[PDB]
From a paper:
Structurally, LacAB belongs to the RpiB/LacAB superfamily, having a Rossmann-like αβα sandwich fold as has been identified in pentose phosphate isomerase and hexose phosphate isomerase. One active site is distinctly located at the interface between LacA and LacB, whereas two active sites are present in RpiB.
Initially, the structure of LacAB was determined at a resolution of 1.96 Å using a crystal obtained from microseeding using the hanging drop vapor diffusion method. The LacAB interface has a total buried surface area of 2069 Å2 in LacA and 1895 Å2 in LacB, representing 21% of the total surface area of LacA and 28% of the total surface area of LacB, respectively. The interactions between the C-terminal α-helix (α7) of LacB and the antiparallel α-helix (α6) of LacA create a stronger dimer than that established by the RpiB structure. The four residues Ile-133, Met-137, Leu-138, and Met 141 of α6 in LacA form hydrophobic interactions with Tyr-170, Trp-165, Leu-162, Phe-158, and Phe-157 of α7 and Tyr-42, Pro-43, and Ile-44 of α2 in LacB. The Superpose program of the CCP4 suite did not demonstrate any structural differences in conformation between substrate-free LacAB and its complex with Tag6P; the root mean square deviation was 0.12 Å for all Cα atoms. The other vacant and shallow site corresponding to the RpiB was consisted of entirely different residues from the active site, and occupied by hydrophobic residues Phe-40 (LacA), Leu-99 and Leu-137 (LacB) plus bulky residues Tyr-65 (LacA) and Tyr-94 (LacB).
Residue numbers in the entry:
A (entry chain B), D (entry chain D), E (entry chain D), G (entry chain B): 1 to 172
B (entry chain A), C (entry chain C), F (entry chain C), H (entry chain A): 1 to 142
Write the structure that this text describes.
């Protein structure tokens, strides 16, 4: 099985821990998230991971940022993706069993590594079990957003923002 | 300060309690689900619509795990919903993500904790600045 | 398997729900607080006394925040009580600390999460080995 | 104000982060917990922290281990101590305000650093608000254990267990 | 200017530090080396970095492993590359100025981060100063190896060894 | 034990000192540069050729900065040359990389440190095992 | 054997690595250096380690700071101490065999952990071997400084400086 | 800029080379050891005295390992001597420690590297500021 993983600079070390664990468990990992700890932006990596899963390059995805909120939301805003923001094992298992979530988001700065490992393990170990009820929910979720071909598979989608950042437009 | 609230069958009970709490604290509350919504998709999308059409910048969604309301509501272009189950994200998501709404799982978070989470979220303002680039990126997505 | 349970006024509701859960799952339960205890001090010590004086090795204490029952019961020589709010400590405290009981705060932890926590705690045995030096140290203290 | 802090080898890095924060906040810190990451035993540092607080060398204590259960339990098992095991802000504030807890315990391996910082600040910012109700609770709590003069202020208290450990009595 | 960087699992943390520095300095970075700390093989990333430089995707390369010997040797064994193994500023400057080295190798486990930063900056600041003398040396160096079209730009080049590793052929 | 040595004009002096050292210590030395080589390219390739064509498994190349001899000799298929300026790589490169030769820069490393480096390299054998996958990869390259 | 170790905030992580190694080797360690990474001053810990060795509480001492220069110099400026600043195995062995150095200083930010381990190991493994020559050198060294009883065993020796620091006298 | 230099028998050779280098670069050099000193204690203390009595703030001591000149010279109240064998400390010790002198081990550091070390040391000024507290502490010691 192939797992795509991504992250922002705040939790690169937590990403590395999960990457090592996944490989030890026998998974093939596609590391997309930022590779160092230089200030960057969570949507870039959330989108990369999402497209890997959506295009079939990966079976599931895992994304993290300080709280996980930013990167998991970015991941969710993509065709074919159902991203679940879970800082606990209980909602993570639910996400997989009931919503067939294909991307898991975790807050690397709010959840301790031991618990992050547990969440990831529980999520992966869980299996989606279709029911008339959750099938209806999943259908609704998959049809809320309006597809935008300009965003789909376009890695330059955030270039306008990246340029403005370079020009100092987003100063504090 | 206005606050939009909504819930499905599983989150209704806590939603009713939080509503009472909010009113007791002079908050102008707009409840979009006087009766529990059919499911978390309906309740979350109802809160989103009311929020994105109102001048309010704070909302609370209630369901069993929170995960669902955020997953569904985040599909809406321009919407940013944060599942919250601890007190750090409660304020950080508002500060950095300007989270337009937070989702609470009644089966995950106890009432006393939910209130601390809620009050911290409501008391925190979006910081803007460098954070705006990430928000511009998110609002750009489907 | 045997399980000792107890609760004060705040944790009574969840305690009753869990008892029914445990009974449905073939667990032999010993409820030491058929009626809510005066406070978490009385409920925790009742569970502890019944535990240290029985062939059972697992117990669940229910109160509003968990902290109280743990703080109180841990004062008893030989007792080890773990407050549990998440799924990792749920099993690690049993594996490493051979926790004699776990404390759940109903105002902190939702019912669904509480059940996962409880089931993980019940399915986990003490590992012994190197860990015994720490339990020997604890049991030696007041 | 003086804060005594201790930990086992599993969370030394998290302890360092909290120690740094306390100092930046203006607190005087007495670091008792283990200083490196060599396998050791949480009861040792839990007892050390508990005694600093009980004897007035420190005003409050903070202890951490992987889950926090071990070291916080050790801390609680000491005269004059009311140790609160809290992996969340809500119960930590309650612990201080209602039970006048003087020792905070946290699971350094299950709680992320950003949240650990929040729990600590919230616990320190909180003030005990006495009432006839909580005073009765506290008084009951302070009278549960039976004092042992052989434990109180005895640095050689665990020498027996340490020797056995050296002799390999506690092998896996 | 584009700098390609690579590393093995032993020095990923040091690579992250250098990657951060390069970006702060305004360099564009292509991180090829391993992204986590899971046991892997230095030749893989050395080859990746060497090819980025040789094909013009990057202007210069930096590679690191525990001693730097392994990965820098791998980097040197590629067409168009002149890899300089330098754990000191003096020889790094010489490497650039006299031998026009386009790939710098450093021992991430034997050189401290502050010194690694110094070696990198010094190597980048240096400029090749051509002379009839060093041109003859360089020309000789560029003509020692016998090109292999089967290695050049072949991503599956080590697939044979990786399969054996998977089968446990390389056990300890 | 056998040891192959060589040097260019810059490393000649130290090479002569080390040869005498090695001879005094019962080492059988093969000096391929009785007279200083034209440059480090000629000296390194001479050492390499004599090494890859002998029953010896250790060699020392001397030049001004070490870098050159390593950069040059490493271009030869199957050869592995390690520049060494400190005592840890001195033994680790042999243990892990089975370094066929080490390169010492006389303008970088003092004589006393060079001797410690050399002795550590000579007393260390290749560990093989998991490390072979990397040597197999290197020998496969040009 | 007992080893006293100390450090400033810049290399606390390197200190921790050496502390773990010493204990694994069977040494008893007395950690004096700073326990966290909060900005502090190297002379405080260099002096603590020095007095442990001088008073017989420890057999040998090891101190580190970014470059090692500050803390090793502070250590040297104490009665009964012969501190050697060694970023290499060669001079470290010499320090022990010829000068009978009882305190070893290393630059934690300039020397890689693997080499730091080697230096420490080589230093400890070495044994002083008296000769008419080095005995004369050691005698000279031991008689250069003028003893100052106000400094000897006075832990409050730097209080005047610490107060001025608190008052902001040493601003940048 | 003035520079005080000194050396014992083992460091004399390099000291002579560095002297020539310094003169070629317009440095006013004060050599306290025209003839090698009896040992590194004599040479290091001679440099220290000349430095602490002169208005120069840069000095270089030479011996076999450097360690000795620093160990001995640092016993002098007010003196701060740094053994240097790499290019980062070369400047950092001047910036942070205001190192009054640096010691170079001729048996440890090669000539070309020593020169880079020396020039970096000479080109760097003490930063003062927060660093002054540590210097005040050192000058206070015996």
């Amino acid at each position: 099985m192939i797992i795509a993983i991504g992250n922002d600079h705040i939790v690169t070390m937590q990403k590395i821990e999960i990457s090592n664990m996944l490989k030890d468990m026998g998974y093939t990992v596609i590391d997309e998230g930022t590779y160092d700890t230089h200030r960057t932006h969570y949507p870039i990596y959330g989108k990369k991971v999402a497209e890997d899963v959506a295009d079939g390059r990966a079976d599931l995805g895992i994304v993290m940022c300080g709280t996980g909120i930013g990167i998991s939301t970015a991941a969710d805003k993509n065709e074919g993706i159902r991203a679940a923001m879970c800082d606990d094992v209980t909602s993570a298992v639910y996400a997989r069993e009931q919503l067939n979530a294909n991307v898991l988001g975790i807050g690397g700065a709010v959840v301790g590594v031991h618990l992050i490992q547990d969440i990831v393990k529980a999520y992966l170990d869980a299996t989606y079990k279709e029911t008339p009820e959750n099938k209806k929910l999943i259908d609704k979720i998959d049809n809320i957003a309006k597809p935008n071909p300009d965003q789909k598979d376009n890695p330059h989608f955030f270039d306008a923002e990246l340029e403005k950042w370079a020009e100092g437009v987003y100063h504090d | 300060m206005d606050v939009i609230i909504g819930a499905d069958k599983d989150g209704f009970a806590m939603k009713e309690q939080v509503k009472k709490y909010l009113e007791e604290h002079q908050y102008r509350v707009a409840d979009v689900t006087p009766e529990p919504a059919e499911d978390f998709v309906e309740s979350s999308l109802a809160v989103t619509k009311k929020l994105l059409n109102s001048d309010a910048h704070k909302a609370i969604m209630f369901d069993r795990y929170g995960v669902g309301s955020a997953m569904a509501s985040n599909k809406v272009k321009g919407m940013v919903t944060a599942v919250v189950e601890e007190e750090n994200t409660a304020h950080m998501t508002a500060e950095h993500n300007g989270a337009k709404a937070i989702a609470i799982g009644t089966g995950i978070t106890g009432y006393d904790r939910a209130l601390v989470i809620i009050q911290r979220y409501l008391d925190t303002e979006y910081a803007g600045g460098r954070h705006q680039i990430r928000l511009d990126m998110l609002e750009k997505m489907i």
